[PDB]
Amino acid sequence: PIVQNIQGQMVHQAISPRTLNAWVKVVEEKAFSPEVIPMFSALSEGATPQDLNTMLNTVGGHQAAMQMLKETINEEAAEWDRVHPVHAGPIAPGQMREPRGSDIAGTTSTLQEQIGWMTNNPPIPVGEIYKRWIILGLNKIVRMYSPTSILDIRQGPKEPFRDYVDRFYKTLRAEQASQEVKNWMTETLLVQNANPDCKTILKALGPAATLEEMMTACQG
């Protein structure tokens, strides 16, 4: 990943083994849960497409998820090539040729060319584009790992309200259908599926009730 110097300029730097070790360990230990996308975006800030291909190929196991991510990256690269055709002929001396989708992916280009793209004037953010594509692929992967659907949630007679709302919001963050649909769901489905006693305790507070009073009602 590129790093700025004392005078402000930046140059390529070898990827730290600690970053790769932490990424592989968090992938192994935390599997594919909603909290891998923020850590992935934090680990590889400013990473070249070669570094992202490294961080993806290094993930042993869960090869189906990695194949899904590869297919998503392939579709995004095809759409990028369709929306931005590259020109042919001689290239200007002060400009380097613009990358194609397969080259934005970093599959058929050298590291020096990535560094030249990233440190050009004006700079070309190939790393950020490929990171956005990988984040979309990881969103689709965490959607696939979702164990249950949002509608099938029903609290057991003994399962505490805390565990119920924990499971609910876990699969809700794993759903990621939309934002306003999520807002409507947390109003309706959250109170629609409570245990009868605590259910009517929550209905006593009306729809204006917030989550804090919703929990301290059934609390104790």
Which CB sits closer to a copy of itself, 51 or 117? 51
Per-residue contact string for residues 7-26; x = within reach of a copy of itself by CB under 8 A:
xxx-xx-xx-xxxxxx-x--
CB atoms within 10 A of CB 34: 20
Residue in 4, 183, 192, 200 binding a copy of itself, rule: CB under 8 A: 4
- Yes or no: say if 76 and 56 are a contact pair by the CB < 8 Å rule: no
For a copy of itself, the closer CB: 89 or 147: 147
Of the two residues 95 and 216, which places its CB atom closer to a copy of itself in the complex? 216
Alpha carbons 217 and 219: distance in angstroms, whole number: 5
Among residues 94, 108, 122, 212, which is the contact residue for a copy of itself, using CB under 8 A? 212
Closer CB to a copy of itself, 97 or 182, in the complex: 182
The two three-digit tokens of residue 109, written as one number: 């280009």
Provide, rounded to whole angstroms, the least separation between the CB of residue 186 and a copy of itself.
Answer: 8
- String marking each residue 131-150 x if it binds a copy of itself according to CB under 8 A: ---------x---x------
Nearest approach, Cβ of residue 89 and a copy of itself (Å): 25
Cα–Cα distance measured from residue 209 to residue 191, given in angstroms and rounded to the nearest whole number: 10
Amino acid symbol at 215: M
Q: Judge contact between 203 and 191, C-beta under 8 A.
A: yes
Instruction: Pick between residue 18 and residue 82 the one whose CB is nearest to a copy of itself.
Output: 18
Alpha helices in the chain (DSSP H): 17-29, 37-43, 49-57, 63-83, 101-104, 111-118, 126-144, 161-175, 180-192, 196-203, 211-218
Tell which one of 32, 54, 81, 113 touches a copy of itself (CB under 8 A): 54
Q: Pick from 111, 112, 116, 79: which is nearest to 98 by CA? A: 116
91 is a site residue for a copy of itself (CB under 8 A): no
List of residues 6+ apart from 108 with CB closer than 8 A? 102
How far CA 184 is from CA of 113, 187, 188, in Å, comes to 48, 5, 6
Interface ranges with a copy of itself (CB under 8 A):
1, 3-9, 11-12, 14-15, 17-22, 24, 30, 33-35, 37-39, 41-43, 45-46, 54, 57-64, 66-68, 71-72, 140, 144, 162, 165-166, 168-170, 173, 210-212, 215-216, 219
